[PDB]
Amino acid sequence: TLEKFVDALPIPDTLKPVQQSKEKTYYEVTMEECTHQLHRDLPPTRLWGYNGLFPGPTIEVKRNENVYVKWMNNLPSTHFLPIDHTIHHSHEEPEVKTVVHLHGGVTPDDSDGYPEAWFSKDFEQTGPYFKREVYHYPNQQRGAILWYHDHAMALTRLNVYAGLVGAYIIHDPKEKRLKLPSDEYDVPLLITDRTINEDGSLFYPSAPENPSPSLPNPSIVPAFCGETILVNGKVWPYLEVEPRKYRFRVINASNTRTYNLSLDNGGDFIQIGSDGGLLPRSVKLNSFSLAPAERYDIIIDFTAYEGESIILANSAGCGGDVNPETDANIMQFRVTKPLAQKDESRKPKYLASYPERIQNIRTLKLAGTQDEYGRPVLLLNNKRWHDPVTETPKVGTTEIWSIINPTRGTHPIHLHLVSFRVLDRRPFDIARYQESGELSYTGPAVPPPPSEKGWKDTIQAHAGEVLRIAATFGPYSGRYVWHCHILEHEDYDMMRPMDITDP
Ligand SMILES: [Cu+2]
Ligand SMILES: [Cu+2]
Ligand SMILES: [Cu+2]
Ligand SMILES: [Cu+2]
């Protein structure tokens, strides 16, 4: 049992380009097995990290900066986490496959990290949709918090759990005039839950509880809940802050876990941004939900709290009620850093302008069948990944997607390429829907909360509700994906191709 708040929060260094001109910025990032200490009292942990770091280096770019990243695999030929060879069928494929997805990137399709565009060490073998070694990110999109992570077919949950996550921030110079906290007062917080063995090794389950002797071994599990919470690669850390305003880029980089965050003194956050950038107006919040892959861009004002220790707390359980001594804690702010200068930052109310013909309305069901071993296989609209593509929006057109969730839990649905607006949620009769396919509403539609009135790319589709979103598909055409971002679901098999067409 690990003592909370004994290690300082690491802040990943910002990556430096290999080459840079006015016309092009070129980066190199190599996936490496590495070892890092995750807590004062733990032996160092074997991890996989981008440039050997966990989290990977923060990448900072400007809006419209012409950026290239050569993501390279220099990993061992065998995994250290348990592979289930039964969940995917294919010559010999390598055991360790990787591909990097820039989550939220407005990105040409062959640079988006398609799950079948994977590569092994030194690109020796490549998947059937691989086109290029050096990914192109034109960054023609709103300032926002993005993040990058592995997306390889049938291995995403393992490769991400291993450590392959990092932040990517797009800065729009037109927002500088808002005077939001910046530089050292603008800090990413990548939250990852983990279970760690006494010898410092990562624990990831090789089977569910009570496995039959015919269940494959290893077997995928449908959800993972870590015993410990890390921020920026350290267990239950502390951060010393100045008594002033900070901006935090809060990223949920966990496999399954949803957080519900608050400050233990009852203090408020100010939300300034969602996945897709600044909200139209700042939103004062006492708490917020944060499902896998969601980002909240927030201001915490420590001005009136000098000397205090304030816990970033969590009320959401994972596989049970939250434990006050463990997963109810994220990190600890200590307002004990002297002011380096006057706080000239602002927490303005007016942040951005607010968020068209409906070409199509797609009705989509979240469901799942059972495999020959009795395991649940989670599916989008009862199709497998490999089935012919059905979500085929036309480029430059707007659609409404109506996501029906008759399952017992929330699924955070992510669409690549685009960000979208949230229209509403509406409860329905689950038994009736399961029995007949008939959708009968048991309540009026509810508009999104203020947090969800801007632009999103990953959205909680709660149980027994229809969620409606609207997106304009573009600016690129090509082969992308949409999926549940619970990685244990994604990999078996809650992920579908999404082809944006250009007739
Ligand atoms: Cu993602
Ligand atoms: Cu994505
Ligand atoms: Cu799911
Ligand atoms: Cu994805």
From Swiss-Prot:
Temperature dependence comment: Highly thermostable. Optimum temperature is 45 degrees Celsius for SGZ oxidation. Optimum temperature is 75 degrees Celsius with ABTS as substrate.
Binding site for Cu cation 2: H103, H149, H485
Residues the record lists as binding Cu cation 3: H151, H416, H483
Domain Plastocyanin-like: 44-80, 97-174, 236-314, 370-501
Function, in words: Multicopper oxidase that catalyzes the oxidation of a variety of substrates, including phenolic and non-phenolic compounds. Substrates include syringaldazine (SGZ), 2,6-dimethoxyphenol (2,6-DMP) and the non-phenolic compound 2,2'-azino-bis(3-ethylbenzothiazoline-6-sulfonic acid) (ABTS). Has no tyrosinase activity. Is implicated in the biosynthesis of a brownish pigment that characterizes sporulating colonies of B.subtilis, and which appears to be a melanin-like product and to confer protection against UV light.
Binding-site residues for Cu cation 4, renumbered to this chain: H411, C484, H489, M494
Outcome (variant: H483C): Decreases copper content. Strong decrease in catalytic efficiency with both ABTS and SGZ
Record-marked site positions (Plays a crucial role in the protonation steps): D112, E490
Record-given protein name: Laccase
Domain remarks in the Swiss-Prot or TrEMBL record: Glu-490, located within the entrance channel of the trinuclear center, plays a key role in the protonation events that occur at the trinuclear center and in its stabilization, controlling therefore the binding of dioxygen and its further reduction. Asp-112, situated in the exit channel of the trinuclear center, and its hydrogen bond connectivity are highly relevant for the overall reactivity of the laccase but do not appear to play a critical structural role.
Native source species: Bacillus subtilis (strain 168)
Outcome of substituting H489A: Loss of laccase activity. Mutant fails to develop the dark brown phenotype typical of the wild type strain. Decreases copper content
Enzyme Commission number(s) of this protein: 1.10.3.2, 1.3.3.5
Induction field: Expression is switched on about four to five hours after the onset of sporulation, a time that corresponds approximately to the stage of spore coat synthesis and deposition.
Enzyme class: oxidoreductase
Cofactors required: Cu(2+)
Cellular component terms (Gene Ontology): outer membrane-bounded periplasmic space
Disruption phenotype: Disruption of the gene does not prevent spore formation, but mutant is blocked in the appearance of the brown pigment characteristic of colonies of wild-type sporulating cells.
Keyword Nucleotide-binding included in the entry's annotation: no
